[PDB]
Design a protein. Structure first.
Lengths: 512, 512, 512, 512
């Protein structure tokens, strides 16, 4: 039997992975023993990125194997064209039920449904082609129903379960637990769904997308996770001397430094993200780590079931996140812009049976578009023609292919959506609000469609504080990176039908 | 606020409705206090039929408002063409989430998905366009997972929970409970799903299809429902002197009398349905009533939640079944052929607020195709052009429209499917294995595509034992009924585009 | 090489076929030597019918192999659903270019094109999937352009080329030629298109739909065709003693007797069709025969090219009409209602090489739905599942299959269209304005959806003057015919997906 | 009334436009009095380019308003995805019949038709959505049929009409006429189709795509066009000292210099294009000019009809070409690679009525993608969201918009097709065989996906002989152009659905 468990957490940064911290002789300041098991048994990818943010775009890339340039689900609230083949439909093509827990944050194609469809009132709903066995549901109704049915009385505004405990609590970064017990947390919910699904399968081959919401905000944790980590033990946020000097690097930086609000990160909180002080940021980070360890605890329950039923060694397990989180870096909160911490994400893969490269940490450059092709390759399917990504399976056996990519790529589109509208500030039209990034071990280039470009020397400036793009002494380098990214664009134009040929012998296909 | 609760039970006969029994001065030999509440508050339809059987075809009609002649999902295991507009998609068109609990038994259109799709391994899966919030799942995996997660240990073959209690139990009609406790029954499962969904909604307007599996077989009940009714208190089965004399009426009757097996009705049972004796049939009926009262008990929990939250008077509640059940009538078990008990089904409708016709029992002839138009009319939508059914709303206020139908209609297709293959016995090709029925208070005509027709005088022969179709003295009557059914065929040809017109002023539509 | 020439004339009656007239010892009062060649070399079908009228519906049946009950292009100006597979697309499936001359009178599916599409201003345009190589074009623009480019000056209203010659001419049935020379006639036009297409092919395998407009009205002929036949030599029209006694048979008869206008049949004419006298009707018939012989002359040019290039013996030639013409019968002009002369049409088929049944006249009952399956069978394709018709090829070799149909069937829908609106007169809604007909050598039954039925004894009443349906002594017969037609309905329900099955081994198909 | 005549010639270079030659004080060495009329009455665009070559890709751009990056019809023989809205369908959306003469060289989408479709045996057939009124047809069957029907006897291999006259003629560049009389030329054919269509319209509003094949090769002309121009009077070809020094600039240059054959340009000719001597090249150019003047003569007939019927002042006339022709430049023949002469094309536009800018010559940078939006804007339609081009109408009135593009762009894909397969030579995979170009008055940058880039200083090196891209002193410039092209890529990502938004008020659209 072959099973696939695709664990997709939300908003979990690549530098919050203990196996890699320990590899580099850093303090592993959070605990994730179950993720650590996967790392010991599998391959940990240390230069993995999501190809776009935030959740909608990122999950479109993950679940289609396409760049944002191809999928066009460019922001939350923007439709995903039905024409793209997604992992759910592809899994049906190899005889697998595409069972899904969590959410995909997918807006339907308006050509396919009524303009009155309630799916158009929310950020996104379930992507067509999956089989939902544990949905969050829009407005988290699935979760809240489950809490209510478990007999826990909810407040009148149900997200107020995430206010810190106590009538006197000040909303924001907090050393108080949330107002929801651990047993009724969202992470418990998703886990119970997983266990229910796996028990229903009763040994039959499975695919399961196991989605967790955490550590997405609000940054508040059920007891005792809220108190598990000390703020002084957390890595310091990396940021310029003040928000104004930060914002000076680029107009998009300025937009987000100015506009991000604390209430988008802590339930009920007032004020700007940028004005959080170091102590507050450290508490936030400790809470974030609490959330992370709550997921890991829950994963241990899923893993225990696989072990007890003798399915662990038959399961390909992929752990990843949809995207990262600034976590105060550069005066930002969230997953926006162009900085590494918004895009870099974990990826750990444990093959079936004893893995050839168990415990290895891979520096080859991998992108979230690669995960769908990997899964399909593993299950013996054809990788669709149209995918931009490649299978990672060679990494599990012999290593990085000679001809593998030599740069990481990602994209961000910041056109106006109902809750964040930078266009007027920036002076831009809707189709001119994007950027792409290309990077390697040495240099990072950020190319904006209609704003200035950025270029960082990552050996000297690993935290991206010193734009060099407009320095004449760097002209040849910036040229070279603009040129690599331009080649990337041309190599990734849509491939739907481009292998077909008419000719004297009729319709054919080209394979090379 | 306007809500819709569409309760769809499975295999529940119209003559197992206490309100109607009492109206006709019969003993109401089963208890259904919650259904009785709906009857007291709403309109009970006493001449309602499903337009086809079994579950797949019936639910296609229910959920599209189409005859089988139009929907073509002619048997279980036969695809439903994606072109038909179903209630789920139509509900999205009026801004409602099409939440569904239970199942639809729908085989996908092969033009829309891979031939490898696991949905093609089972009878049917969920119909496209619904939002599942409590699926049985193929092979009842949803249920069995929920049982397992609740900590109940299941047997190795999970349907063996429906063997009668005790190692010594003889499989078949039984006075022993099943091996599943009430708290872990399927009806409990669907109810918990309903309550979870409604609690998640938290007062917001809803549509919910609340599906129950019971009283579908196996005819075994959790304690103490197995013992709730005495076999001597049940209505006697209505059948000919012996199976051979029964089978003589028609070749299709003979097919089913000969082939139906007890193991399709009682878990693990051996032998033919037809050879059950009167005592066995009475026990089966008592068990069936047990199952029915277990549903009604569960409905009381859903209704209690609506009452406690003040939503009862804002909810249109429709109770119906997908089809009926022979229950030993005519030596048959199941939902097959042409007899009234396979097609006649409950229908009770309680409008929002104090109903103008509360407690009324309606004799107007209504068909399951009418339910979708009723729901959409009630929610202020347009009834799609293509529907064969009409809205029932006039019945809730002034009564039967002057121009309402004056005959009931239904259809059955018996072409070969993997578990029941009458073609070779009958001598027929696949496109020649159907019948249609037309009836009124006086006469019933059964027209077969390629076998002999049947005609019953229902005043003299209410139980359809004496075919008159080949009696010359009935030629004018049979003529008249063949002619009504033929007019019916012509009046119901597909209406997808037939209202459109080209002409000098361009494209238009005709409304009358 | 295998070629197919499908010649489709318009409005040509089956009883205007000399080979059959001579077979029955009648005077062959018109000349058609080229059609007579096909008859001598092939099989002439004497009981062929179009399954519906007028041109749009008839050509939908011809070009899809579907009954009107399935195709739903129920009247002129009503869309043809894109879902039906037509002969053009099927021909592409066997590697043939679906070249077409003439017209198909097809209204596009509004779901496929803008509501502003100019194709919605006319009766119909070209059916999707054909390759036009000689279109009439809407409003006959293709023709009129060709005339103008040939240097003939057209009148200001271009159809006035069909006024009889002379300023003093009275419009109507005429012994004067039209105002267009033979060399610039429509039949010359289509022929020149054919020859141009065949010369372009230069021996390569072809399919060609060679459409002629004639003998469709206006009943006026280029010289000397207008004078070729004497009115006294024509068959007398068959009609009741006066229009009122005619109209009494049925309300639909009354509608058409009352409403048909002469200007729909003769350019510029005033007055009712019904009031034409016997002399006028005889002239009309002589003109009609003139038109027919002009087509036959033109066919001789196409046939001469096939002969000179050695392709005759490699070509399957099918000659047929879209429908017939009342030609004064029953006080009617046109193709309407239920009478034999509107539906009965020629069919002659000459196979490649020396035909086994050369010169034979076939009485087996054949329908226009059979022609598409015949063509595809001949070219080695699969007959689509969805076709209602069957291949005629067995008739060319061994004869009528044992299991061939034993009745002829056709349909007419008379719902309101911009130029003919019987609904208010009849008292009917749009979906209640149809009939179907079933007949054999002895009896004819006409079943109306919502009007009275008709039944004729064809041995005693070959011209359908004496309705017997309401005669009690005929109850068993009418019963029997209503019953055959009802079986026909059930046997012909849509077959798109009904051969597919889910089951344990996955998706399969049933072949029998 | 508003009419549109879109004249699309084939293979006509921008520097073969007399009005522009005379404007720049050059000898106008060819005569085109009818094109000159349009120039005197309208606006001549002197910096117009096709966005890709050869014919298939170019006509996809022209007829969709999309870059090659979006349409993906990347080479001849590669399918055009049905999802793109083309001008034919858009014209139906404004109530215009999309009449077309010539050809579109469009390979159908294989998801839409059988793999056996004969349209897959040729380079391309007619694009879906047009109404053909004068097709060349695959293999020019339409033309050759018309010749044959006109009574001209064709040779056994019909393209041998383009061998030079005389049994002794050497195939290649020639001072002999072709073997087809002027009256039976292809340009006469298209013209007769136009006149036939316009006469059929009889004053009603029209759209007509009037396609000419000439001056596409074979470079041989009917008498006396073959002798109309002296070889010594032609502009000299611009090329390096020898083919090897030419080929050294870039591997793609080398491919084409090496592989192009004379038989692709002159009927029956042997040998390489590159080895033609100056005299031969001059003759070729004189023949090419002959072909051009034959088109112009034919246009005068169409224009005469518009004048005689009083429609000239009601017609928007757009004259353009699908692409250019190297004509010996850079040792090349054809439309390949990256040089200006393959991409630069005429564009002249005469508005209805007396034009505000009659006689003006516009230097604003315009691209073939702009033509569809112009036509639709002119006819009062919405420009589709998805178009990459913009309407040119502002140029006809006030001039170049302030915010108009400041660079020209084009693309070439050279992946393997049946007749030209550079991949193995180049060492490339199929999705790595493309380039894009960006240019302005001063500099030209050619960016290859997987080969070296090129950069020209057009003031010093107008004929693109000196690549500077690898010169360090040009690093900042090449950077700047790579960066403009990269911004171009990002600004032109697919726009199908990217204006839609979900949100609290339901589905909406963003306009800015």
């Amino acid at each position: 039997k072959k099973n696939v468990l695709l664990i997709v957490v939300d908003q979990w940064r690549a530098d919050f992975v203990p196996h890699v911290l320990r590899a580099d002789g850093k303090i592993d300041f959070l605990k994730t023993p179950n993720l650590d098991r996967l790392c010991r048994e599998g391959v940990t990818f240390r230069n993995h990125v999501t190809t776009c943010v935030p959740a909608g775009p990122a999950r479109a890339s993950l679940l289609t194997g396409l760049y944002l340039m191809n999928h066009r689900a460019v922001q939350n609230t923007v439709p995903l064209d039905q024409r793209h083949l997604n992992l759910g439909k592809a899994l049906r093509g190899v005889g697998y039920d595409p069972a899904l827990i969590g959410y995909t944050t997918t807006v339907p194609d308006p050509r396919t449904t009524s303009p009155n469809d309630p799916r158009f009132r929310v950020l996104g709903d379930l992507m067509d082609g999956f089989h939902p066995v544990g949905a969050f549901e829009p407005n988290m109704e699935g979760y809240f129903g489950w809490v209510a049915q478990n007999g826990f009385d909810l407040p009148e505004h149900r997200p107020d379960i995430w206010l810190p405990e106590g009538e006197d609590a000040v909303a924001g970064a907090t050393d108080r637990p949330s107002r929801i017990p651990k047993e009724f947390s969202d992470s418990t919910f998703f886990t119970e769904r997983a266990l229910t699904y796996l028990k229903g399968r009763d040994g039959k081959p499975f695919f399961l997308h196991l989605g967790y919401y955490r550590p997405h905000p609000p940054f508040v944790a059920s007891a005792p996770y809220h108190a598990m980590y000390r703020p002084e033990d957390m890595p310091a946020p990396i940021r310029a001397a003040n928000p104004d000097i930060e914002a000076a690097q680029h107009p998009l930086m300025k937009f987000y430094v100015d506009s991000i609000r604390r209430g988008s990160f802590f339930q009920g909180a007032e004020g700007s993200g940028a004005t959080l002080d170091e102590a507050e940021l450290r508490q936030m980070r400790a809470t974030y780590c609490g959330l992370i360890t709550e997921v890991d605890d829950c994963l241990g329950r899923v893993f225990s079931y696989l072990d007890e039923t003798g399915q662990w060694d038959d399961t390909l397990i992929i752990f990843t996140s949809d995207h990262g989180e600034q976590l105060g870096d550069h005066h930002l909160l969230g997953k926006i812009g162009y900085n590494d911490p918004s895009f870099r994400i974990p990826l750990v893969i444990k093959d079936a049976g004893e893995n050839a490269r168990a415990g290895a940490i891979e520096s080859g450059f991998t992108e979230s578009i690669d995960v769908m092709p990997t899964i399909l390759d593993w299950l013996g399917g054809k990788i669709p023609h149209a995918c931009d990504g490649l299978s990672l399976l060679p990494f599990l056996s012999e290593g990085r292919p000679q001809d593998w990519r030599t740069e990481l790529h990602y994209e961000y589109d910041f056109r106006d959506v109902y809750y964040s509208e930078p266009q007027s500030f920036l002076g831009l039209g809707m189709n001119d609000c994007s950027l792409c990034v290309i990077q390697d071990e040495r240099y990072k280039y950020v190319h904006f469609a209609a704003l200035p470009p950025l270029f960082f020397d990552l050996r000297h400036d690993p935290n991206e504080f010193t734009n060099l793009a407009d320095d004449p002494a760097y002209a040849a380098l910036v040229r070279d990176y603009a040129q690599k990214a331009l080649s990337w664009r041309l190599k990734h134009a849509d491939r739907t039908l481009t292998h077909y040929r008419s000719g004297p012998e009729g319709l054919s296909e080209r394979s090379h």
